[PDB]
Amino acid sequence: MNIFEMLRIDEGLRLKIYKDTEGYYTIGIGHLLTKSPSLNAAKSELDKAIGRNTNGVITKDEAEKLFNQDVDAAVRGILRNAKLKPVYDSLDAVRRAALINMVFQMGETGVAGFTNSLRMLQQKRWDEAAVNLAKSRWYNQTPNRAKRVITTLRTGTWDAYK
Ligand SMILES: [Cl-]
Ligand SMILES: [Cl-]
């Protein structure tokens, strides 16, 4: 199991513009297109991201290309962030995937905001960090997915995904 297969399970694959949990226009593997309510603003962004006139439909390869970009952008955002970098460096390889996961879903600004949990992660206080992360809008809105991520963090194993 690795970050890519982990995120593909959490996000799924959709080749046609869809709306995410929050209602935003998305496509492929959790690739957010726009927060705007306009389906046209969405097609527009989609064509911009792909480099062709898509009419809201992409191929698997296109979806996988956006996905590779986004995981890389996720890792780089963590290593560039003064709040995140230190937690990340401190963690084992499994735990690292889990923070990448959070960052992919919520953006670096958002995860950087979980101040207390990051501090408990850095101190390797696994159970307490788990209890604290669950006290969030995140957990309340996408509980099955949060649970899995949280579990990866608490245990350092891929159990939740197997
Ligand atoms: Cl893009
Ligand atoms: Cl969920």
Side-chain angles (χ1 to χ4, degrees):
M1 172 84 50
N2 58 61
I3 190 59
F4 293 88
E5 313 176 340
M6 194 194 195
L7 278 166
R8 167 75 188 62
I9 285 175
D10 282 341
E11 300 285 353
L13 168 70
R14 292 212 241 157
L15 303 187
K16 166 99 252 253
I17 299 187
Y18 68 97
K19 283 181 212 213
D20 72 25
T21 307
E22 290 282 327
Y24 311 121
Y25 279 126
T26 304
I27 200 168
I29 306 133
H31 183 76
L32 171 72
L33 288 162
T34 177
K35 279 169 197 200
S36 134
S38 162
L39 174 71
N40 288 302
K43 291 164 161 209
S44 164
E45 282 298 306
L46 178 63
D47 288 350
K48 186 167 49 103
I50 293 300
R52 71 184 178 74
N53 222 94
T54 72
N55 219 11
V57 172
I58 60 176
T59 77
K60 194 168 176 98
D61 287 0
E62 288 170 346
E64 282 163 3
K65 173 154 205 196
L66 294 181
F67 187 33
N68 278 328
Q69 295 168 178
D70 298 336
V71 173
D72 189 43
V75 180
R76 288 175 299 82
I78 284 155
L79 303 169
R80 261 206 274 98
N81 187 282
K83 264 84 163 338
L84 292 183
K85 181 171 192 307
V87 177
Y88 188 88
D89 288 346
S90 86
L91 293 176
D92 59 273
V94 178
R95 304 186 169 87
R96 289 190 187 166
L99 194 74
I100 292 164
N101 189 314
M102 284 171 87
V103 168
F104 183 95
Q105 189 194 348
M106 89 195 111
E108 158 203 349
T109 302
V111 180
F114 289 56
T115 300
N116 311 316
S117 314
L118 299 171
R119 170 202 92 254
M120 307 173 194
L121 284 175
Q122 187 164 7
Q123 305 184 83
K124 311 209 181 265
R125 289 175 151 63
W126 327 120
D127 295 18
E128 321 168 41
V131 158
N132 179 270
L133 281 161
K135 296 177 177 135
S136 53
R137 184 196 195 259
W138 165 66
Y139 180 83
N140 282 104
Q141 302 302 120
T142 45
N144 290 332
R145 162 182 198 162
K147 258 172 244 147
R148 282 202 291 277
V149 176
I150 290 155
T151 282
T152 307
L153 285 168
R154 197 199 15 113
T155 75
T157 74
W158 295 113
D159 295 351
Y161 286 83
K162 299 175 331 209

